[PDB]
Amino acid sequence: QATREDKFSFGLWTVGWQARDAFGDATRTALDPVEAVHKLAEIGAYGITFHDDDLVPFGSDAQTRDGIIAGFKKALDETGLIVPMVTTNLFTHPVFKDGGFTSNDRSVRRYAIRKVLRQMDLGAELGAKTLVLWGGREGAEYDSAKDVSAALDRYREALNLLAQYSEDRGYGLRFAIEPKPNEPRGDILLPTAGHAIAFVQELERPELFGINPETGHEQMSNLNFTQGIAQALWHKKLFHIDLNGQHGPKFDQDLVFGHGDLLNAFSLVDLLENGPDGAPAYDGPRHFDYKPSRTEDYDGVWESARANIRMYLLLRERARAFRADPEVQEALAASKVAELKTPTLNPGEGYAELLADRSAFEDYDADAVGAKGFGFVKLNQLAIEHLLGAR
Amino acid sequence: ATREDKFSFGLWTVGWQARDAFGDATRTALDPVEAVHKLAEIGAYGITFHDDDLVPFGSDAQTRDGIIAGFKKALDETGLIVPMVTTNLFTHPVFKDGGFTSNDRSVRRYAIRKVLRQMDLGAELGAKTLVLWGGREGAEYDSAKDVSAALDRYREALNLLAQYSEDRGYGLRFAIEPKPNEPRGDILLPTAGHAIAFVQELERPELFGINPETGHEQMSNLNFTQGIAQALWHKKLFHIDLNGQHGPKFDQDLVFGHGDLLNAFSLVDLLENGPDGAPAYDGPRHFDYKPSRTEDYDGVWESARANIRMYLLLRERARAFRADPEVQEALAASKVAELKTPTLNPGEGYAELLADRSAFEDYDADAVGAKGFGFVKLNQLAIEHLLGAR
Amino acid sequence: VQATREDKFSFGLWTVGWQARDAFGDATRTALDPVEAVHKLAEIGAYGITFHDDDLVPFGSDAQTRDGIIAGFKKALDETGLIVPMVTTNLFTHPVFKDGGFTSNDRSVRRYAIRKVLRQMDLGAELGAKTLVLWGGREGAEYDSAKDVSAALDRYREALNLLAQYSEDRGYGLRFAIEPKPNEPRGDILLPTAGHAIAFVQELERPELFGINPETGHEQMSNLNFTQGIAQALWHKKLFHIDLNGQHGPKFDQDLVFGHGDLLNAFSLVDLLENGPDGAPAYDGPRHFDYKPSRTEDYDGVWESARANIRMYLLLRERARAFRADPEVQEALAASKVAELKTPTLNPGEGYAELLADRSAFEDYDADAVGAKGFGFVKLNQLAIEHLLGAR
Amino acid sequence: VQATREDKFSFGLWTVGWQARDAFGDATRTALDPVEAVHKLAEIGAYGITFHDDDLVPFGSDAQTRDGIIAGFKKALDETGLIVPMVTTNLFTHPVFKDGGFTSNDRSVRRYAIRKVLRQMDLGAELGAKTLVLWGGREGAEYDSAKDVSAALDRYREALNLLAQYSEDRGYGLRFAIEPKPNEPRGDILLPTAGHAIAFVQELERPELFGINPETGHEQMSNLNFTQGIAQALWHKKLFHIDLNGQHGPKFDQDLVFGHGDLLNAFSLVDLLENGPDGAPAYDGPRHFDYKPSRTEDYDGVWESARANIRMYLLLRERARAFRADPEVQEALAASKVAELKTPTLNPGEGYAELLADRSAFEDYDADAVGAKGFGFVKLNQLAIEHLLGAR
């Protein structure tokens, strides 16, 4: 059973996806935001997220806009759901065909910023703490079409303005850049968790910026999602996370969390939950950015919403048991996993004492050490037996 | 090829005996003095090497000393320099779980000593860059390696190297070399971005950059030219390894331009049709490739020349591309240069932007969305330049 | 250069007609009028046009309308001299085909799918098409337990056997080309590569009537060597048609202009198709472009991209011929022993008994001396590329 | 659980015997004695051992040496009761094979390759092996112009026809299994996927004697669905043998323990093999592990890893069994209409004429209403994973 302390959130665009893919028409009718709010509260979610255009149809008058916001607000009210994050749609409308913030067309860039400032206003009114930015159209199909250097300057220029505004209006938002390697552009700028973290480090107020990595995004490049998250945590830039499934380098599948690379889903939950001193290593929302398969109807939709929560709770339970097992604890010792936490250098030791240590080189028996095994297969087999519920 | 082109090769490239994961070596060992002489002849301006490529692992000092002296004499006679040096922290069994990040504390200590030793030699030969390729840093299984602790230990080791270099006045720059996998299932710092992000966290970051390799980024299906552009933006492109690859599969290390030719073209354009008229990058054009296993030493020398030849041919077409009036017109129609103009007018902030009805309230997005960028046409002129069709 | 009708460049109506609605955004271009399409293509040099039933006649058109459209379309063909070399059927767009056409778990959908194809065969026969292309875009699954692959192959076969029967009985004279694709839109599509599709075809009742229609980008989506797969297809005599386009390895289907993805492989492919045995092309069917003008483009970009497909093919053709005609290349081919592979391993009349008696093939063979000689493959590759760059 | 001889788990001598010399480093383990390997495998529950000629008998051993080795080997087999179900030949290590064995551009290498194999068939037939596996690891190219594929397929076929001839004439009763691989060690390998190999086998003189030996990670190196290709191999009845291991998508060949790569695909694979044609195994040959103990391990890790392969197979078999015996899973299958795919699309005796006559198949078909019904695939996939997780 899911509790509000689990912090499961879903985007309105997930359960609301009508299943219009690149090769066919929608197979499901539109979902009413209010209904979405009641259904999600009912399956155990603690919050909902949305793109401006998901809640208010692009081009709605203020009267309409205002009315929609009012009803949405009531729904949250009655159900107790919160809005931990909001985002802006800078990919759908034809105007953004070459990007929002990095469109070659200057007028588009000015417009994309305005669209976002507005969404920032709504987010602050609803109490959202994080603004996620997915630059889906920032990038190119052809190398000569985009000056990457100029693009990074313009991406930077726009973000610095957004931080200025938030800080000045006192919104207290955190900004999370979401990396993606491709799709819809041939290549997207800031293709991985690594490129997004390096870019953020160059902004004016870098402490307000982090990343929102997505499981399938990193897997589209055949990268290890867990190892990437571990790196993000080391830098302290994991501001939010999108969970879903994918089967390697192919179109973005957005399957239910754990329905793609199951072994990596397990090590991920282990990383987020079996944090230092019992406690999770991560504290924000556990947000599912997935899509109910095109072959399903609304029954299938609610089922898939529950499957995400279910997968996460079953994995947590097995990650917990894994760590708690004295036999795993013995295998961990033999493989020396914790020995990596001991500094390489003795306290106060520098280059000169190290050069003076004959045991670190001149008298070191590399051949003898090179022959001892690490016992890694065995430790790995123990983990899978826990995942399989065989231990 | 001029010394000014700065083409360099690793001793281990032309010297690769072609022993692969599935077969025996098909070529005999290449003598280092010989390699220096042959590389000087093909137009290389410099040579690089791992410690163990030059001095066999475990050579006594007399031997080691002898080899260096001969090596230095060959350098002397041909006029070749040593722009970069590196350390083999991957071959010997002791490094099976990594050098700086091995779970075993004693291997970590030995790894640092092995590198300090190589720094002294590099300093001695005049090398300016120390490249570090952490090929054994990573894992096959997620529960076997604590990534957070591994980054601490990677960081602890690099801080010490810089300390030493700086106290001794060596003036070295450090370039981390990213690779997603092979030999490990997953290697730490898998892409150029992960490596740049990491370097920003060291104690003397100004001393650290990256050494991206064409093929390593392509093993993940990333755009090499686009990652180099970001590296240049951060000013962390300290060195570059050029070669060819055909997408995600084992590391092929083909001659530069024999893998993704279109990306090879846009890369030379980026590196050479720099800022002014000038190159955007001024370091060595280093070829980290392998002569195919099917070749003998005639093939080896041919493959070395092919690297230089691909670069010069692409350079020539990149220049011609940029000088074409038809290309200038296509660039003008695709608004490439408009991206260089700030989004905001000088002195404009969020308050002035919010006051501009034309940036939103009266913005005709429908009308803007209907005009084409003409990117296909621009792409077509680039390719025609590549094929010498214009 | 200039395209002639003998080059046989053809384009799908859905190619230049793609409005650019992708998985993440709305259409950026208005609808293309088919008569206009016929006219525009004639002008850029195409010798034929192809289409899906639903590209020409809107799904759910009354008989009157349908007839109306066809007759206008036939006039334009008439007027311009374009032919219809191939026709295909859309079994992927309408929601009813969400689990497939021919292999839908739902039996009623399979029956409907067959009927929809029968109808296109008739229109096809009437327009003079020689090939029926079948792209089973929704045949596959997202989850392994959801599709019995064996049963699906039975049903796939069952539907194809019937179409062959019909065509033969009506005297249509069609050939059928199955088009493989590894994924998108299904997580996994059945008959994922050219290989799997050829193996399948061999199991049909009148296999001589079935071949494949491989697409450059589909094979590359799995990182396979397109040229090598087409060489195998030709070896089997199953290349009934070909879809040309570009792709940048394993990622979503990009459908770029031919030669705008893997340029080196586009070169070797043109070389294989044209620098066939007896000087002549190894393949004589349509050179069909199944690509999409980028979403960033307007109608000018659209006609520009259509012409680019042709320009790319012709520029590569020209370099492939220069390559083969170069004496230095001839010398490199000889040192690489490329043609020695065409001489049989055994001397005429030799069998295992005579091979076993040859001490020189084993007992006295010096593997070590043979293993030391290089094949000169790098030099040969370098010469190919210099020809491609127009540097020679 | 415990492995029985009835489980038919086999290992190649080269698996537990891999010294861990990779492309970037020296071996981390000392050589394993073949007799010791027989004893150790017998002890963990294997029923058979397989080997390449060069794994048992060092390349170039004189006849007395070779004979002594074989004799000691046979004694160990005798004493442990292990059998030799398949043998193979190394046509990839020696420098002479740098451009392939059967398809080297060099004619003399092709003659030597055939003799190396014939000699191995003799030893196999004497040890009682029933299958000869052929992995053409060096057949291919790094550059397109270096290899004529058509000529290569002719030479490949030429060699294989001779081998069938010899076997049939000697009464060896061997079956031949070609093992596909997309790349590594060559940039591109001929017959890259199970599909390509099946299509090729179909062109031999005696196709009934030929099938495939597909490997889990080889198909995953192309990001293909292994279970789905296995399903197709079974449909063609060409699954002669199988190599089980683990891989993480497109990268170098990892050869991890079976189930340590794509766990979900491993699960549906065991479901297909054991519960295939309903309840009964769809495959009865060896369950062969072609894996490598990680380079980080010592001999204790090697035996642990050999045991992990068997454990993984048995755990998944148990979960696959429970999955199918679950009345809720059955109900989901019914709802998803999985079995309805097994019912012919056409009625008994119905032809195109009758089909064309059925208005319910088209004229009166409500596509729109059918298109709106959900298949319930997500729910079915969730039950499958809950079985795998032991949560049900």
Ligand SMILES: OC[C@@H](O)[C@@H](O)[C@H](O)[C@@H](O)CO
């Ligand atoms: O591939 C789509 C991407 O994952 C998207 O769903 C974002 O997360 C959203 O635009 C911001 O939350």
Ligand SMILES: OC[C@@H](O)[C@@H](O)[C@H](O)[C@@H](O)CO
């Ligand atoms: O994949 C091998 C790697 O690219 C290596 O050759 C490095 O470049 C070298 O160890 C540092 O220069």
Ligand SMILES: OC[C@@H](O)[C@@H](O)[C@H](O)[C@@H](O)CO
């Ligand atoms: O990926 C889509 C596929 O390539 C399609 O365009 C087909 O070729 C058509 O359905 C049959 O011609």
Ligand SMILES: OC[C@@H](O)[C@@H](O)[C@H](O)[C@@H](O)CO
């Ligand atoms: O990748 C190596 C290949 O998988 C090999 O192990 C073959 O199976 C063997 O040579 C035939 O048995």
Ligand SMILES: [Co+2]
């Ligand atoms: Co996504």
Ligand SMILES: [Co+2]
């Ligand atoms: Co997301």
Ligand SMILES: [Co+2]
């Ligand atoms: Co490399």
Ligand SMILES: [Co+2]
């Ligand atoms: Co390198």
Ligand SMILES: [Co+2]
């Ligand atoms: Co396509």
Ligand SMILES: [Co+2]
């Ligand atoms: Co196509």
Ligand SMILES: [Co+2]
């Ligand atoms: Co293998």
Ligand SMILES: [Co+2]
């Ligand atoms: Co194998």
